[PDB]
């Protein structure tokens, strides 16, 4: 009970500081952020 | 004066040149450019 | 009202609303992120 209760609080201190552990979910958003900004920039192209 | 005896004060002026280069231009909400990046320098 | 536009030869369809920003006095029109005209100066009197 000393080892397990300290181990959950190291997860809460890591997620409050390091933001790159959740960056696999941030690559879901940033691939969709380039996908919705793909079709906006194609409207300014003259296409010949 | 206080073309022969004409005197003058102090001023400076500069002469630049142009090259076919590409800039990046940042636009704000007010239409004033706050940053410019030349591509081929660095 | 949604109406058809002819503004100095340029055509479009939209709703005319009042601009709250600060614009150039020599500006004929301006472009959006897709490079279509979202704002245009009135020809007879000065309003954008």
Swiss-Prot record, chain A:
Annotated organism of origin: Severe acute respiratory syndrome coronavirus 2
Annotated function: Subunit of the fusion protein that is processed upon entry into the host cell. Mediates fusion of the virion and cellular membranes by functioning as a class I viral fusion protein. Contains a viral fusion peptide that is unmasked after S2 cleavage. This cleavage can occur at the cell membrane by host TMPRSS2 or during endocytosis by host CSTL. In either case, this triggers an extensive and irreversible conformational change that leads to fusion of the viral envelope with the cellular cytoplasmic membrane, releasing viral genomic RNA into the host cell cytoplasm.
UniProt name for this protein: Spike protein S2'
Residue segments, region Heptad repeat 1: 1-47
């Amino acid at each position: 009970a000393n080892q397990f209760n300290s181990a959950i609080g190291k997860i809460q201190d890591s997620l409050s500081s390091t933001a790159s552990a959740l960056g696999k979910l941030q690559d879901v958003v940033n691939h969709n952020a380039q996908a919705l900004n793909t079709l906006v920039k194609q409207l300014s192209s003259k296409f010949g | 004066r206080s073309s022969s005896g004409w005197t003058a004060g102090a001023a400076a002026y500069y002469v630049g040149y142009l090259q076919p280069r590409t800039f990046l231009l940042k636009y704000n909400e007010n239409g004033t450019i706050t940053d410019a990046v030349d591509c081929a320098l660095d | 009202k949604c109406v058809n536009f002819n503004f100095n030869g340029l055509k479009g369809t939209g709703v005319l609303t009042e601009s709250n920003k600060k614009f150039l006095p020599f500006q004929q029109f301006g472009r959006d992120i897709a490079d279509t005209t979202d704002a245009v100066r009135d020809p007879q009197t000065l309003e954008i």
